[PDB]
C-alpha cells in the first residue's frame, strides 16, 4: 500500500508568497512559477524521504463560492494580491498539464474537503498518510490509522481526547475566520453583528461533556443552541461532509490522468526554468 501525501497547496504557496514577495512590489508570473515549483520540490522531498511517495496537491477553489454556502450563506463571507492570484492560477494549470501530481481542484470545494475525504478513504484502505499543513483542523483526521501531519513553515509535526475537544470547541463557539458563529448567537452573527454586540461565553465543562458524549448536546444545550449545533456540524466536522461532495472528490481522484513524466523537462525548458532541469529527480 503506497504511502500518500496530501498537501494543503493553495495555502502553502500563498503563505510562502506572502512571506517572500516584498510589499509594494509587483508580482510577476516568473516570480510565482519560480516560487511554486521550489515549494513543491521542498515539500515533495520531505514526503518522499519519509515514505509518502504519492503526492496529491489539494487546491482551494472558491471561483463560484462554497458548497457550504448552500447550507450557510454567511460562511466565509500593501501586497499585490492581484498579480499573485493571476499568475498562481496559471501555474496551477501548468502543474495539471505537466507535473506528476494529482491536482485536486474543484470549484466550490475546499482543499480541506479533498484532504478530509482522501485521508479517510486511503487510511481505511491501508495506506500510511502524510498531511502537509499547518491547519489544526486536520487533527480531526488523526483518529484514522497511519495519519501524520507536518507543518512546513516551522517544520514540525502537528500532534494531538484533545482532538474531540478542539473540534467541539469550534462547533460550539464557532470559528470567526470562516464566519462560523457560536451556537449561543444567531447563525449569521459575524455577517450581521453590531459593534454593540458580543458573543456569550460557552463554559468548558459543557464543551467537554459534549465532546465526550455528543448526546449531551440534547440536555446541555437549549433547543435553540442545539439547532445551531447541528448547523455548525456541517460547517466544522469533516464527518458531516455530504455523501455527494465526498463521492465527487473520489471520482475526480480516480478519473485523474497524470501526464507522462517526460513532460516535466520540456515544461521547465519551455518555462525558462533551466536551473531546475538538473533537479527533475526531486519532483
Ligand atoms: Mg483549508
Ligand atoms: Mg473547515
From Swiss-Prot:
GO terms for molecular function: 5'-3' RNA exonuclease activity; 5'-flap endonuclease activity; DNA binding; RNA-DNA hybrid ribonuclease activity. It is an enzyme of class 3 (hydrolase). It catalyses: Endonucleolytic cleavage to 5'-phosphomonoester. The keyword Iron-sulfur does not apply. Pfam families: 5_3_exonuc_N (PF02739), RNaseH_C (PF09293). GO terms for biological process: DNA replication, Okazaki fragment processing; DNA replication, removal of RNA primer. SUPFAM superfamilies: 5' to 3' exonuclease, C-terminal subdomain, PIN domain-like. Keywords: DNA replication, Endonuclease, Exonuclease, Hydrolase, Nuclease. Its EC number is 3.1.26.4. SMART domains: 53EXOc, HhH2. Plays essential roles in DNA replication by removing the RNA primers from lagging strand fragments. Exhibits 5'to 3' exonuclease activity on either RNA/DNA or DNA/DNA duplexes and endonuclease activity on either flap or fork DNA structures. This is Ribonuclease H. It comes from Enterobacteria phage T4 (Bacteriophage T4).
Amino acid at each position: 500500500k503506497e504511502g500518500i501525501c496530501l498537501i494543503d497547496f493553495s495555502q502553502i504557496a500563498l503563505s510562502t508568497a506572502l512571506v517572500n514577495f516584498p510589499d509594494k512590489e509587483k508580482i510577476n508570473l516568473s516570480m510565482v512559477r519560480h516560487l511554486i515549483l521550489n515549494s513543491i520540490k521542498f515539500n515533495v522531498k520531505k514526503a518522499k524521504t519519509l515514505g509518502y511517495t504519492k503526492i496529491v496537491l489539494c487546491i482551494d477553489n472558491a471561483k463560484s463560492g462554497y458548497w457550504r454556502r448552500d447550507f450557510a450563506y454567511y460562511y466565509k463571507k500593501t501586497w499585490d494580491w492581484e498579480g499573485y492570484f493571476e499568475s498562481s492560477h496559471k501555474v496551477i494549470d501548468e502543474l495539471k498539464a505537466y507535473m506528476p501530481y494529482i491536482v485536486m481542484d474543484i470549484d466550490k470545494y475546499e482543499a480541506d474537503d479533498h484532504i478530509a475525504v482522501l485521508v479517510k478513504k486511503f487510511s481505511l484502505e491501508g495506506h500510511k498518510i502524510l498531511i502537509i499543513s499547518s491547519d489544526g483542523d486536520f487533527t480531526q483526521l488523526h483518529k484514522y490509522p497511519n495519519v501524520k501531519q507536518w507543518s512546513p513553515m516551522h517544520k514540525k509535526w502537528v500532534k494531538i481526547g484533545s482532538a474531540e475537544i478542539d473540534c467541539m470547541t469550534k462547533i460550539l463557539k464557532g470559528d470567526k475566520k470562516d464566519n462560523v458563529a457560536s451556537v449561543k448567537v444567531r447563525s449569521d452573527f459575524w455577517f450581521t453583528r453590531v459593534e454593540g454586540e458580543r458573543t456569550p461565553s460557552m463554559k468548558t465543562s459543557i464543551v467537554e461533556a459534549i465532546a465526550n458524549d455528543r448526546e449531551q448536546a440534547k440536555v446541555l444545550l437549549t433547543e435553540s443552541e442545539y439547532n445551531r449545533y447541528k448547523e455548525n456540524l456541517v460547517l466544522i466536522d469533516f464527518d458531516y461532509i455530504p455523501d455527494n461532495i465526498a463521492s465527487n472528490i473520489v471520482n475526480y481522484y480516480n478519473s485523474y490522468k497524470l501526464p507522462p513524466r517526460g513532460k516535466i523537462y520540456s515544461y521547465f525548458v519551455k518555462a525558462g526554468l533551466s536551473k531546475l532541469t538538473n533537479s527533475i529527480n526531486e519532483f
